[PDB]
Amino acid sequence: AEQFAVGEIITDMAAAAWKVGLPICIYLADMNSSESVGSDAPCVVKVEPSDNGPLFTELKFYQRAAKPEQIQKWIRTRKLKYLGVPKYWGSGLHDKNGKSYRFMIMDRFGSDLQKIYEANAKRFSRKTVLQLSLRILDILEYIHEHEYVHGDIKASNLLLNYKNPDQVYLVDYGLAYRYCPEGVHKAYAADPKRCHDGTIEFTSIDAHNGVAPSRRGDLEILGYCMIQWLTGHLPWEDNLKDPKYVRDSKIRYRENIASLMDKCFPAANAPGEIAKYMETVKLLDYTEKPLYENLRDILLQGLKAIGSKDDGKLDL
């Protein structure tokens, strides 16, 4: 079922016109023109059945949090170079072959980080890991301040800007969670209308305990990615078919972070900014607002330690 005739012009709810291209159900897209949509198209159009739950969830997040001017204004005020939240360009409803579809136009990207990680024999340098994590912290602060948590940070959800390999973006908000609607934090409890536990090797202890994801969970997920990226491994990676095992290790390692460091890093040679990062996340209550700038400054010490600085170079 081809949802679009290639090269057709579609108009979104605000009457903005777009041309649809070849796929990369996501298709290359661009502004309406006499010219065809090329391989170097700046946008993609995602189309799903109108009854698809995740697309609606993702679209609401994009409308609410990723308006182009909204993002630019944040970038300018917080004095960032960029912000890795993809931009929302429009959406609508598309009926084809007697069925109803929903579509959304968003930024197009280059490679995901997982392909790059694997091509590098599953290692990122300390430099690369710290630079990635600083920008992810910028992203998490932004979405958290707009009432959402992601719940599933990982390399395959991190894409490079297709025209700038030093900018990384966090994608996939189909199972993102609105933890703070109208400024009222969700209680420490399960959400019946939510099925997802994240990705098993990276997910939060909260998620393992069947509680809705919150801000501390996102920072914890990022913690586990940092270790994975630095070392090629997590301690519980042998037994991911048993979520009981994975939660148990996580809980015990949270209780003793030095033993996590000893386990994951050689000898007596563990990067202290990572330990400090995890110690800081461990102190967070379920409903508590992280001190994002403190977390960034902890990472900045890692860079100072290795003879570098936050120069924006991901060094991939």
UniProtKB/Swiss-Prot annotation:
Recorded disease: Pontocerebellar hypoplasia 1A: A form of pontocerebellar hypoplasia, a disorder characterized by structural defects of the pons and cerebellum, evident upon brain imaging. PCH1A is an autosomal recessive form characterized by an abnormally small cerebellum and brainstem, central and peripheral motor dysfunction from birth, gliosis and spinal cord anterior horn cells degeneration resembling infantile spinal muscular atrophy. Additional features include muscle hypotonia, congenital contractures and respiratory insufficiency that is evident at birth.
Effect of residue 170 to V: In HMNR10; uncertain significance; increased kinase activity resulting in increased autophosphorylation and phosphorylation of COIL, H3, H2AX, TP53, JUN and TP53BP1; reduced protein stability
Keyword Ubl conjugation attached: yes
Keyword set, alphabetical order: ATP-binding, Cell cycle, Cell division, Cytoplasm, Disease variant, Host-virus interaction, Isopeptide bond, Kinase, Mitosis, Neurodegeneration, Neuropathy, Nucleotide-binding, Nucleus, Phosphoprotein, Serine/threonine-protein kinase, Transferase, Ubl conjugation
Cross-link (Glycyl lysine isopeptide (Lys-Gly) (interchain with G-Cter in SUMO2)): 46
Chief location bin: nucleus
One BP annotation, GO: protein phosphorylation
Regulation of activity: Active in presence of Mn(2+), Mg(2+) and Zn(2+), but is not functional with Ca(2+) or Cu(2+). Has a higher affinity for Mn(2+) than for Mg(2+). RAN inhibits its autophosphorylation and its ability to phosphorylate histone H3.
Residues of the full protein shown: 20 to 341 of 396
Any one GO cellular component localisation term in the record: nucleus
Catalytic function, reaction form: L-seryl-[protein] + ATP = O-phospho-L-seryl-[protein] + ADP + H(+); L-threonyl-[protein] + ATP = O-phospho-L-threonyl-[protein] + ADP + H(+)
Compartment annotation: Nucleus; Cytoplasm; Nucleus, Cajal body
Domain Protein kinase: 18-292
Residues annotated as the enzyme's active site: 152 (proton acceptor)
UniProt: ATP binding residues: 46
Protein's name in the database: Serine/threonine-protein kinase VRK1
Family the UniProt entry places it in: Belongs to the protein kinase superfamily. CK1 Ser/Thr protein kinase family. VRK subfamily.
Effect of residue 287 to A: Does not abolish autophosphorylation
Organism annotation: Homo sapiens (Human)
